[PDB]
Design a protein around this ligand. Structure first.
Ligand SMILES: C1=C/COCc2cc(ccc2OCCN2CCCC2)Nc2nccc(n2)-c2cccc(c2)COC/1
Length: 300
């Protein structure tokens, strides 16, 4: 009550945060490119700024928790927290991050196939696994691992980018049971997430298997996880019927296909991630090591 939580409201002052570009709007809210130019000389660092789309009390509270999560993370493969801007005369909240120029990995794979080969895909895979190892040391569950939430700094570096659904494990449990679900990315969910709302490191590993599938489909039209699962369940189905059939499909070993051109050994990693037995899924540490050994065993 007495001494309010530490925060630096002078680090990013709204009057010096200059708009450069709207980058995207979505479930995550809205993200812009800005320049922070305190010496009003048309210079300063370029930053990414996350804002809410609908500024309800619940969303602001969720946003505060998301900011605290990101601030607590420092890793080469996690987007870098810089600070907060308390704009509207310190009656609003905006998240300030480093700016990563190539956007989401989902878009990058579609827009920049000219500079992507299997070596790069394996490098991105490795980096995502290492980011996720680090999250696990904090007992954070990402819950939304998907190429749309991974950001691209350059041809050699990706970072896990959005933490809007991330949960902190209870002290005594290895899973978080989400008891207020919003919009759910069901085609990335593990079966126990679909059927019991249970999220864990192992359910992030399931989602990572889907990420790995995404990478090797090169975000080809008709090959996205939603498109493939809908083709398998029946494109005609609507509403809850989709979820019912997805669960039944996954519970009896229905899986996304091997992407065209995907090596069998990479598909084997996917299918090991997609184990209905939670305890039998590999760890992110297992996965980083295996992928880097595959990379390292190539000639050169
Ligand atoms: C990305 C979603 C769409 O790409 C936006 C996008 C994003 C970036 C660069 C280009 C770009 O779209 C360049 C192409 N845009 C498409 C429409 C106009 C520009 N860079 C960036 N850098 C740091 C943090 C975030 N985004 C960030 C942090 C939290 C949440 C998000 C981003 C939103 O989810 C991840």
């Amino acid at each position: 009550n007495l001494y309010f939580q530490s925060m630096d409201p002078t680090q990013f002052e709204e009057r010096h945060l200059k708009f450069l570009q709207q980058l995207g709007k979505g479930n995550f809210g809205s993200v812009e490119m800005c320049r922070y130019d305190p010496l009003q000389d048309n210079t300063g660092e370029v930053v990414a700024v996350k804002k809410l789309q609908h500024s309800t009390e619940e969303h602001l509270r969720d946003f505060e928790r998301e900011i605290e999560i990101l601030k607590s993370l420092q890793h080469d493969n996690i987007v870098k927290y810089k600070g907060v801007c308390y704009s509207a005369g310190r009656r609003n909240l905006k998240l300030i991050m480093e700016y990563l120029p190539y956007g989401s990995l989902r878009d990058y794979l579609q827009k920049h196939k000219e500079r992507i080969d299997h070596i790069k895909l394996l490098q991105y895979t490795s980096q995502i696994c290492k980011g996720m190892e680090y999250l696990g040391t904090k007992r954070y569950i990402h819950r939304d691992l998907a190429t749309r939430n991974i950001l691209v700094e350059n041809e050699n570096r990706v970072k896990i980018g959005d933490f809007g659904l991330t949960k902190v494990l209870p002290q005594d449990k290895e899973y978080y049971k989400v008891k207020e679900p919003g919009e759910s990315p069901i085609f990335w969910y593990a079966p126990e997430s679909l059927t019991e709302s249970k999220f864990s490191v192992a359910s992030d590993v399931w989602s990572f298997g889907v990420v790995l599938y995404e990478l090797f489909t090169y975000i080809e039209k008709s090959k996205s996880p939603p498109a493939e699962f809908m083709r398998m369940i029946g494109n005609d189905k609507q509403g809850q019927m989709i979820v019912f059939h997805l669960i039944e499909l996954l519970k009896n070993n229905g899986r996304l296909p091997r992407p065209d051109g995907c090596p069998d050994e990479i598909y084997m990693i996917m299918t090991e991630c997609w184990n209905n037995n939670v305890n039998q899924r590999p760890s992110f540490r297992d996965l980083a090591l295996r992928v880097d050994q595959i990379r390292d065993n190539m000639a050169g």
